[PDB]
Amino acid sequence: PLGSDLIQDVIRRAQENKQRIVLPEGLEPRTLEAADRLMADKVVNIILIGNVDSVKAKVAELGLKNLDEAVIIDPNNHPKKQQYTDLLLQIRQKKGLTPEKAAELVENPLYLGCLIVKSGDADGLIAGAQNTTGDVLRPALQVIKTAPGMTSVSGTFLLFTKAKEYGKDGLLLVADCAVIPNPTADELAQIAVATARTAKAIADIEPRVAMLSFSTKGSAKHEMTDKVVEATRMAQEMAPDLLIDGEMQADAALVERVAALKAPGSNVAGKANVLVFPTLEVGNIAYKLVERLGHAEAVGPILQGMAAPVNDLSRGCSVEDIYRMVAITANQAIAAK
Amino acid sequence: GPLGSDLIQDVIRRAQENKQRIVLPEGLEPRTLEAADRLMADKVVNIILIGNVDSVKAKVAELGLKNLDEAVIIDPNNHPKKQQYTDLLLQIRQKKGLTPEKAAELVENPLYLGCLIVKSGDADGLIAGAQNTTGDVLRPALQVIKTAPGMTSVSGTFLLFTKAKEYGKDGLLLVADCAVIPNPTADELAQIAVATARTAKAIADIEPRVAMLSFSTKGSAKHEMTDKVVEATRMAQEMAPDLLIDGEMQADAALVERVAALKAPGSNVAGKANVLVFPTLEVGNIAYKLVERLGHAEAVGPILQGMAAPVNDLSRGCSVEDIYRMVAITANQAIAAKE
Ligand SMILES: CC(=O)SCCNC(=O)CCNC(=O)[C@H](O)C(C)(C)COP(=O)(O)OP(=O)(O)OC[C@H]1O[C@@H](n2cnc3c(N)ncnc32)[C@H](O)[C@@H]1OP(=O)(O)O
Ligand SMILES: CC(=O)SCCNC(=O)CCNC(=O)[C@H](O)C(C)(C)COP(=O)(O)OP(=O)(O)OC[C@H]1O[C@@H](n2cnc3c(N)ncnc32)[C@H](O)[C@@H]1OP(=O)(O)O
């Protein structure tokens, strides 16, 4: 119930600017059920990957009545197979892919799905109900690649807290909580800019980005603090339109009275709604403790920094969670154009 | 507030039942004196104040405090044990190049004198930092009192009283190291784990189950940074076979039975943790503050651990009630150290 209002807004913005979303796991029942609801509610235009007769059989078997307009693409046989094979070789031959092996890969639903998006025949992709994170992300990084002026992808969570005096009515975006173990200064700056733009695209927030540390504005100098200082500088340079400040402690980021004392004349401190963590140790631990010990609702991870949005579901994701992640993906696609 | 109030009441009561001698080096600081007055009224501890006797008595009369006539006041410039404490200080710090000339200056510094009083067995613990920096409190404590048997590192723990009563002990977890060591080695992290578990036992009447946290659970995400937590876990288990310590694990595996069953089957900690050990100060400093603010948890501390006799450091903005509370904690640490 925390963040059902925001998710309702995300669904509506998807509905108002309809994106084409590829679901490579076209025989997975949770995926198909979610696809049926998304098409009933006209949230997105669905593309399912699988043998056409098998997918249609499974749709009829699950009693789904809203998928007649879904496009179904058999990776073994479809009119753009050679085109996508040629595109794949163009992207990946140099990197050791033979035409022999390109012909195999193009028949793998995850690779095919990424090539559909990359070609401009779709706007985004969701998988991972029946694949590992790595098998989803790898083709996405190889084929779709990163957005202009970015070399790294990262994972953000929407963190809907019960503390409505922080963030946007209790919501903060937090990153990187899933992908990069130990970002360099450069990576951390890219995380900062990416998360701010996700904040704008998904949460309709005016981002104020806190680059977190155990130091605030030189209070605790150390090797680990220097990286966050450099990251802050480089983020500010990469994006002069965005409010980004650091290094600061979490209390300076969130609490006006502490901001006044330790970070005076920051335009972020005391008002942060985006938190950038210096390592995955920090991010992975911190968001889970806020989720459990704070009773916060965490939505994600949401992958950011891709030229076109790919998201990765968990293997235990509900129908409603798949629906939700597709709606988010559509919003990321709108932002990417 | 109300989350911590039952346990803090127990801590004060256990102090009252075995009265310890606590040194307050900042003997003219008004918040400290007010707290000392309440502690003496309530018979929580025997207070020792450091300062010129006439000045301290003048300040006591000036603040209208009626319960400090039995407080011991030691003037650092002139008191019966000055040469004894000076000789002790030279004996501890001669190797390290302290001259008798410089010993004679240091022994007159209230923070050094306070530590020598404890070290000599003339007190049981010390509290300062209302008017001194953390570093000026810690330095004499580490030089004079030093670390407990079998420990080389001192760390800081918080009592974290959360609103999630289904975790920890009715919502309480101890977390460390959240204040002192920026980047513990594997050995330091193991010592943090054993120290915090024993603090948990002594202060919070917790049966410690210690989770060594990482972004990996039992080899799920192997990496350079996870290796330190794996090694720390092994070394902690070896140092303390009487304690339940496991790792590496994620915070969800530490706290959630359903996740523990999947990611850490046959841990005797996972899903039941009540002590969390963080791999770095970045993690600890950020994580406890986010839980405090975003979770509405109450955090008490930092509490210093690993000292041969307890020294605690107050913040410069600490209330009278917070000083009272920290003195009660320190007395409980002394009771644990003597046992
Ligand atoms: C390694 C650990 O288990 S600890 C980290 C804990 N976190 C996670 O596991 C979550 C996901 N982490 C990952 O590493 C992802 O699963 C993966 C898919 C990016 C790793 O991919 P790998 O199987 O290592 O393949 P490899 O790194 O050889 O190739 C993946 C491609 O993406 C690139 N890449 C890897 N990480 C990133 C990133 N964060 N951003 C952008 N590109 C990346 C690689 O350079 C490579 O590109 P290339 O083939 O064009 O050179
Ligand atoms: C503040 C920064 O720049 S780093 C990042 C943030 N850190 C913090 O917020 C924590 C605050 N901590 C501190 O002030 C320091 O860590 C201190 C006080 C513990 C150490 O600083 P100093 O008192 O100047 O110690 P210094 O480095 O001068 O001397 C080291 C001595 O203390 C000892 N020591 C230092 N830290 C510790 C510790 N955590 N545990 C045990 N012993 C210690 C050394 O072994 C050495 O002993 P010796 O006198 O017998 O040689």
Residue numbers in the entry:
A (entry chain B): -2 to 334
B (entry chain A): -3 to 335
The authors write:
Porphyromonas gingivalis, a black-pigmented Gram-negative rod-type bacterium, is a keystone pathogen linked to the onset and progression of periodontitis. In the current study, recombinant Pta (PgPta) and Ack (PgAck) from P. gingivalis ATCC 33277, encoded by pta (PGN_1179) and ack (PGN_1178), respectively, were prepared and enzymatically characterized.
The structure of PgPta in complex with acetyl-CoA was determined at 2.0 Å resolution. The asymmetric unit of the P21212 cell contains one dimer. Structural comparison of the subunits of PgPta in complex with acetyl-CoA with those of MtPta showed that both subunits of PgPta are in the open conformation, with a root mean square deviation (rmsd) of 0.89 Å (314 Cα atoms) and 0.90 Å (318 Cα atoms) for subunits A and B, respectively. Structural analysis revealed an acetyl-CoA molecule bound to each subunit, with seven direct hydrogen bonds or electrostatic interactions between the bound acetyl-CoA and subunit B. The adenine base is recognized by two hydrogen bonds with the main-chain amide and carbonyl groups of Val150. The 3´-phosphate interacts with the side chains of Arg89 and Lys92 in subunit B. Arg135 forms an electrostatic interaction with the β-phosphate. The second amide nitrogen is hydrogen-bonded to the carbonyl group of Ala175. Since interference of the binding of acetyl-CoA to site 1 of PgPta has not been observed in solution, such contradictory findings might be due to crystallization artifacts.
